[PDB]
Structure formats: structure tokens, C-alpha cells
Design a binder for this molecule. Structure first.
Ligand SMILES: CCC[C@H](NC(=O)c1cc(Cn2ccnc2)cc(-c2cn(CC)nc2C(F)(F)F)c1)C(=O)N1CCc2sccc2C1
Length: 302
């Protein structure tokens, strides 16, 4: 079985490169962030523009949803994160403490915490309610490319240009494990079940790691990734795929177990910096850099 993603919508409105797209947990919405300093909200199923959320003074690298789909957090070159009320568009909190661009962010499952990664080489854990930094982890020796909580929020995985992936105990901030050749690690995230870590390196390679055993299980290649921190995903709604953007302007889809490329989605006219997989339907969102500036929604039968 191969999927058969086809283009459903192209979403225009950002005036600079799109940095990140993410589906709301409830499936209703896509949020997009951009170098244009804006967040935009779009209907997941009809592609309809809903609203613009503004307030950052510089570009945004990443955005993430709370579990109840009511809040967003954004990470900005203004050295802050902001927590947003999606319905009102209002900034509830500005999270201050990083000493350089904030690059990546995520809520925990409970959504009482946010984790952030920065060019300042640190990972910070923030209290959503107070907006105060709870912990600063001296996580890496170069910019942090990704941060992600596991299924229950007990662990954080981080990645860096330093060539390391590290796993952190949330409660204590202590490092439990380093996975260490050491090309820049450009992306990491836990599998939905929390057992595996998907890691991108800037040698055109994605790898699936068993967290428990610290061993590489699968390698995915054929795409182009030597420059940018490109988001990758587990697609679990139909077939079990790996989905990534690519610097050849394509969305790549692999069979997770066999590692074969099963589909390449053509249409973007710049680097596909971000992909996201819908929580319940076989829908991918993709987004591209400044020669394109659009988001595409794609749908598959499997
Ligand atoms: C080649 C240019 C530098 C590069 N850039 C991205 O790699 C990159 C990547 C992304 C996507 N992203 C964001 C968080 N995780 C992934 C976004 C944006 C983005 C930010 N802004 C402004 C606020 N605007 C943009 C957008 F995309 F809109 F042009 C840049 C970078 O940071 N690297 C180099 C590779 C590695 S490997 C470990 C660490 C690093 C650091």
C-alpha cells in the first residue's frame, strides 16, 4: 500500500517565509508561523483563513498548541515566547529569559508546561499559568534545533547543531541519555507511544531510534536536507509513514518499517521547511520558504 495524497488547498497570506505549521489537537485548525512576525489560523478541512495573531516584534520560528486546542505558544527572534488565547487573539504571557533567538517550542500533554530551545544553547521549561521560567537546562553547546515532550510529559528530547540528541527528566531537569559520528542534528521528536525518537541530521538522513536501548532501528534517505531544520512526523491515521519536508521543494513520505519512499508531493516552489500530520484524518499540511510563502493541504485515502 502507498498513500495517494493530492493537493486540496493552497493557503496564501504570509508575506515572508512560513516557518512552522501545526494542527490543533482537536483537528479543527492549522496554525502557521512566519518570518513576517505573524501567526495565522486556518480551517483544517476547508482551508479557510480564520484570523491573524500579531504582537511579536521580530519573526517567529515555531508555534505549538495546548492539548485543549485553546492556547498557542510562539517562539521568536525577539528572544521571547508568547502564549496566545486562540479565540481572542490576545497575548496572555510573554516568556522572557532566553538571551538569543527562540527557535522551538512545545506544550506538555497536561499543558501546564512549555519547553523551549534557543540559539543561546539552552532548553527552558516554563510555567504556563505564571509565565515564569521554572528551569534553565544547559542542554547543548550550539543552537537547539528541537524540543519535544513524550506522551505523558515525563521526558523532553532535545537536539542541537552540536551533533547531540539528549533526553531530559522533566521533573528534575537532569539528563538521562545522550545519543551521540556527530553531524548537526536538525530535528527530533518522540513517536506517539514515546518509545522511539525520530532524528534528522544535516547529511540528508532521518533515523528512528529506540529510546530504551539507545540503538538506531531505521534510516530514511533520498530527500535533501543539508541546511535547514526541517520538521518531520509520524503519520498514524492510515498507513504508518514518516513524513518530512526537503530542500528540493518536495514532501517526502516513507514506509516506516520498510524505509521505502512511497510518495513525493510536488507543488511547492521553495524548500519545504515544515510538514504536519492531522491527528485523525489522512491530511498533511506543508509550508515553504520565501520563494513560495504558501501552505498546502493534501489528502489521502490511506
Ligand atoms: C540556513 C539558515 C539557518 C537555519 N535556519 C533554519 O533551519 C530554520 C528552520 C525553520 C523551521 N523550524 C523552526 C523550528 N524548527 C524548525 C525556520 C526558520 C526561520 C526562522 N525565521 C525567523 C524568525 N524565519 C524562518 C523561516 F523559515 F520562515 F524562513 C529557519 C538554522 O537556524 N540552523 C541551521 C541548521 C541547524 S542544525 C541545528 C541547528 C541549526 C540552526
Amino acid at each position: 500500500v502507498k498513500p495517494n495524497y493530492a493537493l486540496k488547498f493552497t493557503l496564501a497570506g504570509h508575506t515572508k517565509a512560513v516557518s512552522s505549521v501545526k494542527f490543533s489537537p482537536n483537528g479543527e485548525w492549522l496554525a502557521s508561523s512566519s518570518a513576517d512576525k505573524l501567526i495565522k489560523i486556518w480551517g483544517a478541512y476547508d482551508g479557510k483563513f480564520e484570523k491573524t495573531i500579531s504582537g511579536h516584534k521580530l519573526g517567529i520560528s515555531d508555534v505549538a498548541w495546548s492539548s485543549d486546542s485553546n492556547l498557542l505558544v510562539s517562539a521568536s527572534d525577539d528572544k521571547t515566547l508568547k502564549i496566545w488565547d486562540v479565540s481572542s487573539g490576545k497575548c496572555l504571557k510573554t516568556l522572557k529569559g532566553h538571551s538569543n533567538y527562540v527557535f522551538c517550542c512545545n506544550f506538555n500533554p497536561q499543558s501546564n508546561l512549555i519547553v523551549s530551545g534557543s540559539f543561546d544553547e539552552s532548553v527552558r521549561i516554563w510555567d504556563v499559568k505564571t509565565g515564569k521560567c521554572l528551569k534553565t537546562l544547559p542542554a547543548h553547546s550550539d543552537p537547539v534545533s528541537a524540543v519535544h515532550f513524550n506522551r505523558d510529559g515525563s521526558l523532553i528530547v532535545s537536539s542541537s547543531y552540536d551533533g547531540l540528541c539528549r533526553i531530559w527528566d522533566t521533573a528534575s531537569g537532569q539528563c538521562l541519555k545522550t545519543l551521540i559520528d556527530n553531524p548537526p542534528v536538525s530535528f527530533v521528536k518522540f513517536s506517539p507511544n514515546g518509545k522511539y525518537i525520530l532524528a534528522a541530521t544535516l547529511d540528508n538522513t532521518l533515523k528512528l531510534w529506540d529510546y530504551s536501548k539507545g540503538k538506531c532501528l531505521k534510516t530514511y534517505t533520498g530527500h535533501k536536507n543539508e541546511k535547514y531544520c526541517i520538521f518531520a512526523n509520524f503519520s498514524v491515521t492510515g498507513g504508518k509513514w514518516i513524513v518530512s519536508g526537503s530542500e528540493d521543494n518536495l514532501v517526502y513520505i516513507w514506509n516506516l518499517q520498510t524505509k521505502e519512499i512511497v510518495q513525493k508531493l510536488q507543488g511547492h516552489t521553495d524548500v519545504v521547511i515544515s510538514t504536519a500530520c492531522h491527528p485523525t484524518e489522512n491530511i498533511i499540511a506543508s509550508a515553504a520558504l520565501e520563494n513560495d510563502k504558501t501552505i498546502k493541504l493534501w489528502k489521502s485515502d490511506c
